[PDB]
Design a protein around this ligand. Structure first.
Ligand SMILES: *[C@@H]1O[C@H](CO)[C@@H](O)[C@H](O)[C@H]1NC(C)=O
Ligand code: NA
Ligand code: NA
Lengths: 251, 14, 33, 251, 27
């Protein structure tokens, strides 16, 4: 995360780290939505242009972590993947539209002070909170800049949702209704963005109606990290919620 | 920018 | 059959303890200025 | 072109500008290889992710230009496209492999002091000049930086070819043998790169064996413009020469 | 013999060099 700041302990208990087993490597961010399910971007599991094509066994996740340069014993938990579910309409052969995926854990992780599920947006939350100017929070362990350069503690930054027309004119890349963008405009004085290693992580919002945290997006893509005139794009979680619920109910 | 309309999974509209 | 679990989104070390984190106020203030 | 410099008059007489007719817009660079043929990158003519899918009539080319902020009367020439030829195995879905295209002109352009064809490499030129360290020349009217910002006079910069291993490790993007990369390494003192607007333009080298200019590359892609640790990628023209010759001979 | 390709009318053809070609030759 570029231009972010250290996160407080227990500030994002649903944060999940997706690791490639060997060579050991932090691949993406992810979120805990239940004791057996983890949400993340599909391009993190399947993206041939980067010769990225993972199967359950190549991967692993760590939950409840705060600092990489330390093993928080009895705190952090590791979980193996039982099954990967990539959104059916996700087509890497273009746009990265519907960039969402689920991961069923082999064994249910135990909730605690540092590990806790986040909520999926109900229609009210989406209707009222998904508006230009409203800020959401992006968290992760990705790079600190577009160039060590890797944080030791979970990073966090708050960014404003941008008007669709501004997102549209900010890139030659065709964008869809399943994506929304966030970031400060050039000359808003403020900066901050997600960077390589943050993809798949959550973009959350705190409901002022019931004080609960809701995941509205999933860090999906961008052209560079924190460049003026450019914005980060996120998977519109609400629009794809029926698929999420389908998978969890049916399995 | 976002809507409260869901992305379709089909073929089988209104 | 599920829009965020029963206890979802309520952080054990924060909401649950009537405590706030250092920046949640910034978000709250962005809801129509 | 980033960190380049103004070009001398008649320095690159094979330079070609590819324009979208309406809205009038400089789309890419291109090169003159004969009085009826122009070479350029395929992604400049066909690239759906940018909703780019042109047909002969949408386009036009200007040859013999030096400065945009001026109409060099009786100097510059305009030519309509008769037919576009994209390489049959061109891959836009993955890594822009075989990013090459040919454009046959409706009418033969008249050569002059400012309009002159560049040579295509023979096996000897390619075997001896395509070495890591050896420098080539990239020219175009693209952006002056990854952020007016658009030059008025044709820009030129010389870049050294880079070892395949450095290229390969410089990006997560899988590269193929149909592309080579170029650019100074971080901390070499020098900089320079092609930027949005230079794509399709030529990467040339001057043979020390017959003092003729040979186009070894076609500006293809990169991650940003002139970033440390990153290099620009070019379509290996020699490897694809048989297709070029096939098209021109057969039509 | 490749036609006249690669020989610029205002440089090679006039025994003249541009300001940066030596940089290429030296590499
Ligand atoms: C994913 O890669 C595996 C392992 O390299 C290969 O066997 C398989 O063909 C790939 N998946 C598909 C069907 O694209
Ligand atoms: Na930005
Ligand atoms: Na560079």
């Amino acid at each position: 995360i570029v231009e972010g700041s250290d996160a407080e302990i227990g500030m994002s208990p649903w944060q999940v780290m997706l690791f490639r087993k060997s060579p050991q490597e932090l691949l993406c961010g992810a979120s805990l939505i239940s004791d057996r399910w983890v949400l993340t971007a599909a391009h993190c599991l399947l993206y041939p242009p980067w010769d990225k094509n993972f199967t359950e066994n190549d991967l692993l996740v760590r939950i409840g972590k705060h600092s990489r340069t330390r093993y928080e014993a009895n705190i952090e938990k590791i979980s193996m993947l039982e099954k990967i579910y990539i959104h059916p309409r996700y087509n890497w052969r273009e746009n990265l539209d519907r960039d969402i995926a689920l991961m069923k854990l082999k064994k249910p992780v135990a909730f605690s002070d540092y590990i806790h599920p986040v909520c999926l947006p109900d229609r009210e939350t989406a209707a009222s909170l998904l508006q230009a100017g409203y800020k959401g929070r992006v968290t992760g362990w990705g790079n600190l800049k577009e160039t060590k350069g890797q944080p030791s503690v979970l990073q966090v930054v708050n960014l404003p949702i941008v008007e669709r027309p501004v997102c549209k004119d900010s890139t030659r890349i065709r964008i869809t209704d399943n994506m929304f963008c966030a970031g400060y405009k050039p000359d808003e004085g403020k900066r901050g963005d997600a960077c390589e290693g943050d993809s798949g992580g959550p973009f959350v919002m705190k409901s002022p109606f019931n004080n609960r945290w809701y995941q509205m997006g999933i860090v999906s893509w961008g052209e560079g990290c924190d460049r003026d005139g450019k914005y980060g794009f996120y998977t519109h979680v609400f629009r794809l919620k029926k698929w999420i619920q389908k998978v969890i109910d049916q399995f | 920018p976002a809507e409260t309309e869901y992305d379709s999974l089909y073929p089988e509209d209104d | 059959f599920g829009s965020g679990e029963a206890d979802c989104g309520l952080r054990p070390l924060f909401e649950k303890k009537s405590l706030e984190d250092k920046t949640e106020r910034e978000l709250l203030e962005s809801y129509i200025d």
